Design a protein around this ligand. Structure first.
Ligand SMILES: O=C(O)[C@@H](COP(=O)(O)O)OP(=O)(O)O
Ligand SMILES: O=C(O)[C@@H](COP(=O)(O)O)OP(=O)(O)O
Ligand SMILES: [NH3+]C1CCCCC1
Lengths: 255, 254
């Protein structure tokens, strides 16, 4: 048999609009992002989606995106589970910095490696960093399945998959195999990590995969829980490609 | 007290304002109710509440109230569990009717009896009722711990307690005993049912308990999960008492 699930990157937030690496900083959705989430809900309603379970990260932007989708569907009663293992990749010291500024300071090539490569690790975030305290002082990280002191201070995409894969295999995949309809409301890089795994994308090719905010990602899996075909974006393809280009351009120098 | 928990009636919804028995009809919060929910969250934040688990009914007004509270607290990551066992009392055939109109036609005393009695069971809702279909055809009732055909068609407050108690005993009580800080976002009568149990209120006295929408209720329990004192509405008692009077007056002609 085959199974289909829906995954997506949270709706736009101020940091996305202002082009600043946000990562573990708990930014909220902005007005545009709330609309993106509601539109996702409307598309899923048009398709008559009936979710059984929803998985999100512990960053509120992914939770609110899910709540808006459920409201549009009239499915607010559907169980939601949130885990740090679906949190966006930890950008370390790059958190708070402007992506274009980094391109000007370090070059487009280096920024592309930091953003999309599989093995490159961002410099770790230090206690002196402006956003260190608010991240590690938050109670949500005192009750994780990993001690506060053991949580990452920066992550390569590979590091992300290493802490996300166990969650997928142990808590999400079993439900998929039970024929349940699942929604994964997450982030750009945590979603890219899962897609790399499910689609068998090489360490080299994953660098060219970019996900825009607020666009449902359709993925079909076979009996072995591997992608039957490439992931697909739901909606106007021209608009979606334009949004993808916008994300890519965040790390480029004006021309 | 050894333990403390917070419970509350969801924020104002369209039918609360229209003064119609809503019960299992899934009406949403209105602008006023959203504000009530947010003020609840602000009041709880002012008192340092840090929830570990949230329990709600499967009616969206209770869920949305919880979501707004969690947002105000910056605690959207806190686990939420929902169950039909926390659903508002099933008003049966009375669903959809205007409370004041009923008082005018049958007498204030009659309406008060239907609304607050512990033992009186409303007439069952039938297939000919305007809101029967949307209730029993909803998918949320196809995945309950009891078959769709077994779900109630009307309930007395006693009936409510009988189906709510198992959920309290099996799922909520154990968490409170572990020392977790719990939030229960429910309804007017389902909350009255739980208060009757926790405070050991008599069948006679429970009739005088009326709960206002969107007001946090603090319950202090001992080692045996018994209330050490009467429930405490958190906030200005004058305004809260006024909101309670508002609910009572829904069944009065004037
Ligand atoms: O970490 C972040 O700032 C973004 C991704 O940024 P880029 O890797 O795409 O630059 O995560 P998201 O907006 O999905 O929560
Ligand atoms: O069933 C309803 O309409 C109300 C209670 O109405 P009364 O018993 O006070 O008339 O419950 P709610 O969902 O608003 O908390
Ligand atoms: N001072 C900055 C150098 C580039 C990586 C992020 C920190």
């Amino acid at each position: 048999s085959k199974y289909k699930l829906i995954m997506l990157r949270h709706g736009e937030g101020a940091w996305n609009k202002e082009n600043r690496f946000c990562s573990w900083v708990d930014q909220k959705l902005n007005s545009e992002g709330m609309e993106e989430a509601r539109n996702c809900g409307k598309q899923l309603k048009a398709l008559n989606f009936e979710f059984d379970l929803v998985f999100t990260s512990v960053l509120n932007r992914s939770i609110h995106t899910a709540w808006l989708i459920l409201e549009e569907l009239g499915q607010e009663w559907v169980p939601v589970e949130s885990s740090w293992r679906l949190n966006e990749r930890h950008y370390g010291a790059l958190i708070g910095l402007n992506r274009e500024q980094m391109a000007l300071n370090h070059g487009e090539e280096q920024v592309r490696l930091w953003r999309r490569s599989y093995n490159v690790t961002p410099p770790p975030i230090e206690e002196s960093h402006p956003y260190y305290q608010e991240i590690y002082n938050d109670r949500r990280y005192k009750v994780c399945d990993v001690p506060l002191d053991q949580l990452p201070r920066s992550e390569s995409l590979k590091d992300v998959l290493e802490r996300l894969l166990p969650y997928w295999n142990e808590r999400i995949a079993p439900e998929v195999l039970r024929g349940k309809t699942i929604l994964i409301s997450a982030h750009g890089n945590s979603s890219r990590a899962l897609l790399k795994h499910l689609e068998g994308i090489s360490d080299e090719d994953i660098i060219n995969i970019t996900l825009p905010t607020g666009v449902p990602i359709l993925l079909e899996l076979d009996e072995n829980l591997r992608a039957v075909g490439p992931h697909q974006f739901l909606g106007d393809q021209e608009a979606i490609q334009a949004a993808i280009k916008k994300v890519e351009d965040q790390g480029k120098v004006k021309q």
